[PDB]
């Protein structure tokens, strides 16, 4: 029971997935690298399989500085604590992987890291992600006629609902751990997610029809509570930032390389049917007003123009 005051220091992590998912692997890499790098003693306790809840729970735990010390979070699950951060990977922000990589290779997102630390007391220590989010539905959704009134779950950040509303869908901010039942029960017709998570949590079992809208390439900060990070000795702080940066690089190389491979695994196994969306690129014009308005409201117009 007896730990070092800021014998050993124990850092508690959370993941929604098992050991086979890129986020869990990224967190294990983080732990490995801190151990390699730190001339000192630290113990990591990673609680997997959503034992400690979902991201919407984790973010409040980190803001409070209790329960868990580190995890990975989607920007669009952080909006209640930092209204600007969902800009980081909002729908249709990135053109392709090359664009996404150019961003993560800079420090252009810095203003958003700063807001998260200031407003939410959550420290970004690296960036993983690299999955491509597509529509996943009970029945095929392949035209704008199909999309009109399409009931779908979105993450809670306002920008998510605003985007899909502009595409004429009917979004619903339903908890991630309630999606499978909500589809199975017909409350909604589908949701949207990347390959790795669809496969790992078996969402194809209730929603076997995937539409290649390719509307998000994920940016997934590796995060530590500000309360924990700021308490750590100065040398361990610096190690955590180095390990986080390297773990993020590892995780996003991993997920981005495996995304298409996993779509193919699910097709080959008869689990998914994959279809293109007719006139998909019309989507880009339709969502531009919503993107611009959001950026303007949070005073991030210049940040968005740079990214584009
Ligand atoms: O849609 C979601 O809530 C989740 O989807 C996927 O599991 C991941 O991108 C995760 O970071 C998100 O929180």
From Swiss-Prot:
This is Solute-binding protein NAS141_03721. CDD domains: PBP2_TRAP_Siap_TeaA_like (cd13603). NCBIfam families: TRAP_S1. Alpha-D-taluronate binds at residues 55, 77, 133, 153, 176, 193-194, 220. GO terms for cellular component: outer membrane-bounded periplasmic space. InterPro entries: DctP_fam, TRAP_DctP, TRAP_DctP_sf. It is found in: Periplasm. It comes from the Bacteria. GO terms for biological process: transmembrane transport. The complex is comprised of an extracytoplasmic solute-binding protein and a heteromeric permease formed by two transmembrane proteins. Disulfide bonds: none annotated. Alpha-D-mannuronate binds at residues 55, 77, 133, 153, 176, 193-194, 220. Gene3D superfamilies: Bacterial extracellular solute-binding protein, family 7. Belongs to the bacterial solute-binding protein 7 family. The keyword Nucleotide-binding does not apply. Solute-binding protein that binds D-mannuronate and D-taluronate (in vitro). Probably part of a tripartite ATP-independent periplasmic (TRAP) transport system that mediates solute transport into the cytoplasm. It holds the Pfam family DctP. Keywords: Periplasm, Signal, Transport.
């Amino acid at each position: 029971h007896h730990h070092h005051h800021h014998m050993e220091t124990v850092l508690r992590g959370a993941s929604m997935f098992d050991e086979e998912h890129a986020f869990t692997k990224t967190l294990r890499k983080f732990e490995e690298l801190v151990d390699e790098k730190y001339d000192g003693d630290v113990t990591f306790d990673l609680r997997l399989n959503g034992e400690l809840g979902v991201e919407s729970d984790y973010v409040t735990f980190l803001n409070q500085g209790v329960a868990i010390d580190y995890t990975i979070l989607a920007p669009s699950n952080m909006a209640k604590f930092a209204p600007s951060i969902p800009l980081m990977d909002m729908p249709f922000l990135f053109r392709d992987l090359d664009h996404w990589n150019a961003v993560l290779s800079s420090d252009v997102l810095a203003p958003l890291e700063d807001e998260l630390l200031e407003k939410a007391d959550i420290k970004i220590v690296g960036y993983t992600g690299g999955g491509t989010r597509n529509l996943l539905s009970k029945q095929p959704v392949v035209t704008f006629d199909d999309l009109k009134g399409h009931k779908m779950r979105v993450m809670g950040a306002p920008i998510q609902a605003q985007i899909f509303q502009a595409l004429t869908a009917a979004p619903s901010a339903i908890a991630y751990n309630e999606v499978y039942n909500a589809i199975q029960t017909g409350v909604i017709a589908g949701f949207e997610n990347e390959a790795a998570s669809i496969q790992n949590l078996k969402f194809y079992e209730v929603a076997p029809n995937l539409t290649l809208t390719r509307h998000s390439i994920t940016v997934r900060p590796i995060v530590m509570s500000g309360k924990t990070f700021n308490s750590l000795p100065a040398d361990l702080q610096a190690v955590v930032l180095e390990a986080g940066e390297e773990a993020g690089a590892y995780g996003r190389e991993l997920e981005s390389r495996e995304d298409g491979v996993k779509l193919q695994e699910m097709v080959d196994a008869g689990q998914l049917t994959v279809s293109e969306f007719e006139n998909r690129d019309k989507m880009l014009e339709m969502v531009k007003p919503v993107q611009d308005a959001y950026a303007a409201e949070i005073g991030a117009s210049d940040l968005l123009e740079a990214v584009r």
